Write a protein that binds this ligand. Structure first.
Ligand code: 1SY
Ligand code: 1SY
Ligand code: 9IM
Ligand code: 9IM
Lengths: 324, 319, 319, 324
C-alpha cells in the first residue's frame, strides 16, 4: 500500500484477468447448458479469432503506411524495424495470420461470408473504424499502458529530481549540517521535502503559512555539472512556530517539479489539464517514494511530506512528522 | 519539418487516413465485382459491428471491475467517473449497446452466440491477443503528450531558460564592460547520444574554460538565494581563439541517460534515443513560440557518427 | 540443512519422485478400476510416447537450424558436436525415432497425423506454449551449477580467503606482539539484504576503527605487489570495548547489489536475494570442506527485519 | 558481430522461429494436399494441445510437491508465489486448463481415450518421464535459457570485475599516468587487459613471454571498500621487447576471473568442466566488452586483448594493438 497519503493510487493489479476468468467460466457453463453440437462452438470461436487477427493485420498495414515516412529518422531507416513496430512480433503474427487464413478458407462456415467476401467486409469495417476514429482506447486502458510502460511525465520529473538534486546533496547533507552545528542551531539530521498534490508551491514559503519563517542558510555546495563549473546547490534552514515559540527547525524545501506541472497546466501548448496535473503529481510522489526507498544514497537522510488542502496548518503537519 | 537535425522525426501526419481511403475504394470495387445482394452484405457488416461493440462493452466491464478498487484514490470516489473512464461515454456507449442488441436479436442461435463472443473476449483479455503495437502506443502518447521528454523540456524551459534568458543580455553586457568579446547568445548543446560529459574540455580538448558570468540570484521553491551560473568557454582553431560564447549541456539528457542505466526506471536505450529526439523537437517548438526568447538562445544538435564539436559550434557561431 | 540462517534454502531433494510414485500408484488403481482391455491402454500409451519423441525430434531439428550458425564459434566447427548438443544423443535418439516410426506405422491416417504433430510442435515453438517454469529453471541451474552466486563464491574463496587465511594467524600474532587482544578468527558479514555500506561505523555507530593489520603482499595476475589488507574494528557495549576482531563485508554482495541497480545486467531484486542466499550457502559448504580453513574464519549471516549488528557480532564472538 | 576474436559466439538469434514457421507452412501445405475433412484437423490439434497442457499441469503439481518444502525460505513463505513459480502465470494457465478440460470432455474423439481414461494414461506417462528422467533439456536449450536469463557464472564475474576494479581505477588512471610522467617513461594513455580464452593466466607475466619484462610501478590508489579502510589498487608498467629493444611500454594486466575459472576447473566440488571453462571464458569476454562499451567511465581509457594459443608471440599482438 501507500503511506504518503490515502489519496495516492496504488499500482494497478490483475483484477481484469480475474473478471475475464469469471466471464470465461460463465460462458463455458452457458455453452454446456445449451447442449448443442460442441464442435460448432470451437469452429466459430476459431473463426472469430481469425477474423480479429485479419482485422489487426489490416489496421497494422494502414498504420505502416504512415510509419514508413518516418523510417529514416524514427526507425533507423530499416524496414524490418518498421514492420515489427507496426505489427509486433513478425514471426508470431505471421504464423497466426497463416493459421487464420487457412482455417477460414477451409473450415465450413454457416455464419459469416466466404473468404474473399469476408475479407472485403472486414477491410471495409477496419477502414471505417480508422477514418471515423470509432476505434479508441478508454482512459483507463491508456493510463494502464502508460504506467506499465512508464510513459508519464511524472516518471521523468521524479527521476530528474533524484538524479540531479538528491543524489548529490544527500550524502553531503550530514556533513554540511555537522559543520553548521559545530560552527554554530540544533537542526535536524534529515531533509524534509513538501509535496503539495495541488501543486500550489508558493515561491515564498512564509507566504504559505506565517508560522514558518526563515532562520538561516546552510553552507553552499559546489560541483561541476553539464559544463557549468562550480554549480551551486544551497538549502535554507527554517524555524517552525507554535504559539510564537520556536518548536523546531528543519532543512525544508518544496519540489520544483510540482511548480513545473502547475505552469504546464497554466500554458496551452503543453496540452496539460488540471486533472492530468493532479494525476501526474500523485504519480510523481509515488515514484519518488519508491526511488528513495530503493536508493542507497538516501539512508534515512531524507523525508517526504505529502498533503492536500481541504482548517489547514502546514506547520502542524511538519512538526508532527519532525517529532516522530 | 524540423530543421534541428535530419534525424528528428516529424509529427505524425494522416497517412493512415489515406491508406484507409485506398482500402475502402478497393473494397467497394471488389464488392461491386462480386455481385452478391447488398442486403446480405449489410447484415454481415452490421452484425460484425455489433459483435465488436459487445466485445468493447465486456472489456470495459472487466476494466471497471479492476478500477473499482482505485475509485476512491484516482477517481475521487465517484462511480460515474469510473464508469466513464472504463467504458467510455456511458450515453453513447449504452445507445450503441441497445442498438447492437436489437439488431442481433432481430436479424437471424442467439444466447450461444453471445456466450461465444464473451468467451472470445475473455481469451483476448487473458492471453493478450489484442495487444497494442509500438507504433499505436507512440501515436497515442504523442497525441496525448503521454511522453517523458515533454515534461523534461517544459521543466527546462520553465526553470532555467524562462528565468535567465531575459537577464542574459544584461549579464553579458556587465561582463563585457567589466572587461574577449563574448557573443550575445546562449548556445545549448543537444547530444542525441545523451553522453553529456561533466566537462567540455574532456569532451573536446579544443575547448577550455575562459571565465564565469555574474551569478544570478532568485528565490525558488522555498529555497533562498537559488543561484544560476554560466561559464564562458573559449573555442579554439589551429591553437588560436576563434570565438567565445556561453556553452551549455542539456541536463535532461543526463537524466535520460541515468534513467537508461538504472534498472528501476524501466527505460531502454531505444526509448532513451527516441525521447531525446522528442525533447529536442519540443524544445525547439516551445522556444520558437516562446515570448521570453527573442533570438537570445541557439539550439545546437549533433550526433556522434571522428566528430569535431568545436567545428560544429564555430559553424553555428559564424551565422 | 544449513545452520547459517533459517532463511537459507536447503538443496532440492526428491519430493518430485515421491509425488510421481503416488501419482503412478493412483493411476494404476484407476486403470484397474476402469477395466478396459490392457492392449488398448498399451497402444494408446506407446503412441503417446511416440508422438512426444517425434515432437522432441522436431524441436531438436529447429534448434539445430539455429545452432548451425554458431557451429564454428561455440562447437569448434564440428557438425557432430552440434547435432549432439541439439537433439541429445544421436544414437539413442535415432533408435527411439526408428522405434516410434515403426510403432506409429504398424499400429492403426498416417501422414496426416505426422503433419498435424509437426504443426503442433511448430506452434509450441513459436507461441511458446511449452515454456519452462521458474522452479524447473532453478532446479536445472542448481543441478548444473548454472548460477551466478557459485562463481562469485568460488572467486572469493580462491582470490581472498585461500591467500590470507594461512597467514592470518601470523599477522594477528605479529600485531599482538607489536602491541587490545584481537581474536584469532576472521569474521565475515553476510547481509542477505546486500546492503554492504562502505563503512561499518555508518552502518552501526557502536562499531569504530581500532587499527590496521600488517599488509600482505603477493604477485597476482601480472600485477606486482598486490596488497591484501584488513582492519581490526572495536565492538562496543554500553560505551565500553566489549571485544575486538577482524571484520569484513562480502564484496560479492556489493557486486550483486550493483548488478541489481544496473539495467544492462538483466538482474532483478528477487534474483539478487536468491543468489545472495545461494552464495552464502555455497561459501559455507566450500569452507566446511576447505583444507586451508582450519576454524580460522567464521561466517556471520543476518537479515534486517531495529537490528543491532554489534549485538549479533558479539554473540558470535563469545562462542 | 564480435571483434575481440572470431571464435567468440554471437548472441543467439531467431533461427528456431524461422524453422518453425517453415515447418508450419509445410504442414499446412501437406494437410491441404491430403484433402480430408478440415474440421478434424482443428479438432485433433486442439485435443493434442489440451493433452500437452494437462501433462504440464501434472508435471507442475509434481514439482510443487517438492517446492512446498522450501516455501518459507525460497518463496517468502507464501503459497501463491510457490504456485506461480511451479505453474507460471496462474490465471493464464488456469484458463488454458479449463479450456482443455472442457474441450476434451466435450469434443468427440476417434483417436484418444475418453476423458478419465486419457487422464489416467497421461498421468502415467508424466510419472514415468519424471521417475526415469526421460524428460530432459538438450544442452543447446539449457545454454539458450541461461544466456537469455543470464544464469551463467561469466556474467557475475564480468560484472564483479567492472564494478570492483575498473569502475574505480579507470577515471583516475589518466591522472595517475599524468603524475607518473610529469614526475618521470612515456607510457600509453589506456589500460590494456589480456583475456586468454584458455585461462592459462600465469602469475608471473615474464614467464609467459620473455619479450615482456617489468619496468616500473604506478602510484598506488587508496579507497575504502567493504569495511576495509585504505584498500589499495596498484598497477604495473611493463616494457615490450622487439629484438631486444624497448618497442613500447604499457599498463598491462591479466583478468583474475580467468584464474578463478581455471581453478574452479581444477577442483571437483565446483562441478566445472574444461569445455564449460572455455564457454564461460568466451561469455565473460563478450559480456565485459558490452559493459565497457555501454559504460560511461571507460571512454577510450581501457582496451581489451583476446587471444587463443594455437608460432605464438604475445608481445607481437600487444605491440600490434598498441601501435594502432
Ligand atoms: N531547491 C533546489 N535547489 C537547487 O540548487 C536545484 N538544482 C536542481 N534542482 C532541481 O532538481 C531537479 C534536477 O535538475 P536538472 O539538472 O535535472 O535540470 C535543471 C537544470 O538543467 C536547470 N537548472 C536549474 N537550476 C540550475 C542551475 N543552478 N545551474 C544550471 N542549470 C540549472 O533547470 C532544470 C530544471 O530545474 P528545476 O525544475 O527548477 O528543479 C531542479 C530539477 O527539477 C534544484 N532544486
Ligand atoms: N589486478 C587486480 N588488482 C586489484 O587491486 C584488484 N581488486 C579487485 N580486483 C579484481 O577485480 C574484481 C573485483 O573484486 P571484488 O571486490 O568483486 O571481490 C574480491 C574481493 O572481495 C577480494 N579481494 C581481492 N583483493 C582484495 C583486497 N586487496 N582487499 C580486500 N578484498 C580483496 O577477493 C575478491 C575477488 O578477488 P579477485 O578474483 O582476485 O579479482 C578481483 C575481482 O575479480 C583486482 N585485480
Ligand atoms: C462469435 C460469432 C458467432 C458472432 O457472434 N459473430 C458476429 C457476426 C458477424 F460478424 C457476422 C454475421 C453474424 C454474426 Cl453473429 C461472428 C462472426 C464470425 C466471422 O466469421 N466473422 C467474419 C466477418 C463477418 F462475419 C462479417 C463481416 F462484416 C466481416 C467479417 F470479417 C465468426 C464467429 C462469430
Ligand atoms: C496429433 C495426434 C493426431 C497424434 O499424432 N497423436 C498421438 C497419438 C496418441 F497420443 C494416442 C493414440 C494415437 C495417437 Cl496418433 C494424438 C493424440 C491426441 C490425444 O488426444 N492424446 C491424449 C492422450 C493419448 F491419446 C494417449 C495417452 F496415452 C495419453 C493422452 F493424454 C490428439 C491428437 C493426436
Amino acid at each position: 500500500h501507500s503511506s504518503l497519503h490515502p489519496s495516492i493510487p496504488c499500482p494497478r493489479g490483475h483484477g481484469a484477468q480475474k473478471a475475464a476468468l469469471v466471464l470465461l467460466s460463465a460462458c463455458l457453463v452457458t455453452l454446456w447448458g445449451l447442449g448443442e453440437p460442441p464442435e460448432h462452438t470451437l469452429r466459430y470461436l476459431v473463426l472469430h479469432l481469425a477474423s480479429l487477427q485479419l482485422g489487426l493485420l489490416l489496421n497494422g498495414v494502414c498504420s505502416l503506411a504512415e510509419e514508413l515516412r518516418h523510417i529514416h529518422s524514427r526507425y533507423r531507416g530499416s524496414y524490418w524495424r518498421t514492420v515489427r513496430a507496426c505489427l509486433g512480433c513478425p514471426l508470431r503474427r505471421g504464423a497466426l495470420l497463416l493459421l487464420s487464413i487457412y482455417f477460414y478458407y477451409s473450415l465450413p462456415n454457416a455464419v459469416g461470408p466466404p473468404f474473399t467476401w469476408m475479407l472485403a467486409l472486414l477491410g471495409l469495417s477496419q477502414a471505417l473504424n480508422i477514418l471515423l476514429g470509432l476505434k479508441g482506447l478508454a482512459p483507463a486502458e491508456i493510463s494502464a499502458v502508460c504506467e506499465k510502460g512508464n510513459f508519464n511525465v511524472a516518471h521523468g520529473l521524479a527521476w530528474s529530481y533524484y538524479i540531479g538534486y538528491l543524489r548529490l546533496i544527500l550524502p553531503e547533507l550530514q556533513a554540511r549540517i555537522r559543520t553548521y552545528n559545530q560552527h554554530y542551531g540544533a537542526v535536524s539530521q534529515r531533509l524534509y521535502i513538501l509535496l503539495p498534490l495541488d501543486c500550489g508551491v508558493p515561491d515564498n514559503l512564509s507566504m504559505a503559512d506565517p508560522n514558518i519563517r526563515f532562520l538561516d542558510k546552510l553552507p553552499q555546495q559546489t560541483g561541476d555539472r553539464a559544463g557549468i563549473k562550480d554549480r551551486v546547490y544551497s538549502n535554507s534552514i527554517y524555524e517552525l512556530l507554535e504559539n510564537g515559540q520556536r518548536a523546531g527547525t528543519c532543512v525544508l524545501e518544496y519540489a520544483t517539479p510540482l511548480q513545473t506541472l502547475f505552469a504546464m497546466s497554466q500554458y496551452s501548448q503543453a496540452g496539460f489539464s488540471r486533472e492530468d496535473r493532479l494525476e501526474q503529481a500523485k504519480l510523481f510522489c509515488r515514484t519518488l517514494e519508491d526511488i528513495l526507498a530503493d536508493a542507497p544514497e538516501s539512508q534515512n537522510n531524507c523525508r517526504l511530506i505529502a498533503y492536500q488542502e481541504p482548517s489547514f496548518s502546514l506547520s502542524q503537519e511538519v512538526l508532527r512528522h519532525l517529532r516522530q
